[PDB]
A and B are shown apart, each in its own frame.
Chain A
Amino acid sequence: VLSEAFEESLVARDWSRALQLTEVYGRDVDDLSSIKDAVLSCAVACDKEGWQYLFPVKDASLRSRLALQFVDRWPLESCLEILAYCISDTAVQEGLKCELQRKLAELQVYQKILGLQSPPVWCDWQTLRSCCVEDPSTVMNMILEAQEYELCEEWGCLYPIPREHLISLHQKHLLHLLERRDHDKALQ
């Protein structure tokens, strides 16, 4: 009778009336964490509220793999937080750390871009990445529209840019840097 509870509460993935029957009638022993992690996973990617179910899974490798798998449907105000502590975990294998870190890079870049103007140069992570797939010129123009060169450095670093105007981009920053006599920055 107790085991006709999961195998019927994981038909409709209501993993809050089925993570109960593993804590109330469960005599909470240590090794139950795996049976809990399974369900919390299988309910991570089933709804638009995916943000708040991939924190409480103890197996770090699962945290990583799932985040890399489903960073897509997330708002840039929450996927950042989800990735932060994973990249700050002290146990994940160093192989996955590089990938998760690299994705954090693009998340940060699209955040900084997404707000230079007072409103929408995009709609979310999604819109801005779609546009970056699209004509990568309006974004570069807006990036230079603040003369904030360093951000454009990344905004192209993730997106190769024209072999002609790249020089016109590169020199102007050196000019601005020299304008204040910042020797080492110009050297770099």
Chain B
Amino acid sequence: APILSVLASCLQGASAISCLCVWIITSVEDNVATEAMGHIQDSTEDHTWNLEDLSVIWRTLLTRQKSKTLIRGFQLFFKDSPLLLVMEMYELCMFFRNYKEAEAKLLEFQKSLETLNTHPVIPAMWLEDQVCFLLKLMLQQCKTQYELGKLLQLFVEREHLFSDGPDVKKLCILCQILKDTSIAINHTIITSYSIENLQHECRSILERLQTDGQFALARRVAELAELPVDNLVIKEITQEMQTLKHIEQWSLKQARIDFWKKCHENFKKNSISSKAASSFFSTQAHVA
């Protein structure tokens, strides 16, 4: 039932930060109400709630999307205090998708967090403790790959957050770096981003770009990883060579000379290491 808890938190001597657990745990579906109860240890009548059980309740509710319940309780109970807006972003994003207002309300959240800092009932630091979970939850759970880019660019400036979150800068860079490509991210970097895991993943992304031939964006992509830019140029060269053989231009001397010259011409534009160019030559030389 859920029209009893509201009366319960109206008699003289009820912890206003308690009855919220009762409401939010007794106004959902069966499996949701049950599987969330695992955090409890004692029996039903001997489990005085505190500012800790709401944590597992919050997490369980947000996971397996159901937010129009929390975004709804926090109005009867503890009012406009900032956690409400920190969750109100989550309806305009990842459900309702009018991102321009999302940017407008997140900054209002920051301003209020700063201003009101100039005793509460949600444990002061508890906000900053738990907002960092709504963030990675709003991020990890998104499905469409192009759906990711808009959030990752929304954040951008306000990077002080995501304490253990993935590195925003390089992430948004990669996002824009495929702003129209057919590829998709893998979320493996998203959940656990590392200085080396990024490369251990992006090697496949580079190979995938290499297969299609759209080599132009490949340079920008591999640039972020600070990986060796060498073989990419040689691969583009081989692709051109096979293209010419398909046009069979290697027989005609003029095109052959033009290609062998544009080879060095472009190679200057890449400033590759000497030895790689020496090999690129000597291989065709022995072939010649």
On A, residues with C-beta under 8 Å from B are 23-24, 27-30, 52, 55-56, 84-85, 88-90, 183-184, 187
Residues on the B chain within 8 Å of A30, using CB:
29
Q: Is B28 an interface residue (CB 8 A)?
A: yes
Known: A28-B68, A88-B144. A183 touches B259 (CB 8 A): yes
Most chain B CB within 10 A, of A23, A90, A184, is at A184
Q: List 9 A-B contacts (CB under 8 A).
A: A24-B72, A27-B29, A55-B96, A55-B97, A88-B147, A89-B144, A183-B258, A184-B243, A187-B247
Contact for B146 among A55, A85, A184, CB less than 8 A? A85
B29 touching A29 by the CB < 8 A rule? yes
Extra contacts besides A56-B96, A90-B145 (17): CB < 8 Å: A24-B72, A27-B27, A27-B28, A28-B29, A28-B66, A28-B69, A29-B29, A30-B29, A55-B97, A84-B146, A85-B144, A88-B147, A90-B143, A90-B184, A183-B258, A184-B243, A187-B249
Interface residues of B, count at CB 8 A? 25
Q: Which residue of B lies closest to A55 (CB)?
A: B97
Residues on the A chain within 8 Å of B147, using CB:
85, 88
Residues on the A chain within 8 Å of B247, using CB:
187
Residues on the A chain within 8 Å of B243, using CB:
184
B146 touching A183 by the CB < 8 A rule? no
- For window 116-169 of chain B, which residues contact chain A by CB distance below 8 Å? 143-147
A118-B257 Cα distance, complex, nearest whole Å: 44
Residues on the B chain within 8 Å of A84, using CB:
146
B97 touching A88 by the CB < 8 A rule? no
Residues on the B chain within 8 Å of A23, using CB:
68
- DSSP class of A's interface residues: helix, strand, loop or mixed? loop
Q: Which residue of A lies closest to B262 (CB)?
A: A183
Residues on the A chain within 8 Å of B95, using CB:
56
Residues on the B chain within 8 Å of A55, using CB:
96-97
Q: Which residue of A lies closest to B68 (CB)?
A: A23
Q: Which residue of A lies closest to B249 (CB)?
A: A187
- Nearest CB in chain B: distance from A77 CB, A: 12
Contact for B240 among A56, A90, A184, CB less than 8 A? A184
Q: Which residue of B lies closest to A187 (CB)?
A: B247
A88 touching B96 by the CB < 8 A rule? no
A184-B213 Cα distance, complex, nearest whole Å: 14
Q: Is B238 an interface residue (CB 8 A)?
A: no
Q: Which residue of B lies closest to A28 (CB)?
A: B66
B262 touching A90 by the CB < 8 A rule? no
- Nearest CB in chain A: distance from B103 CB, A: 15
The 3 closest A-B pairs by CB, nearest first: A88-B146, A55-B97, A29-B29
Residues on the B chain within 8 Å of A27, using CB:
27-29
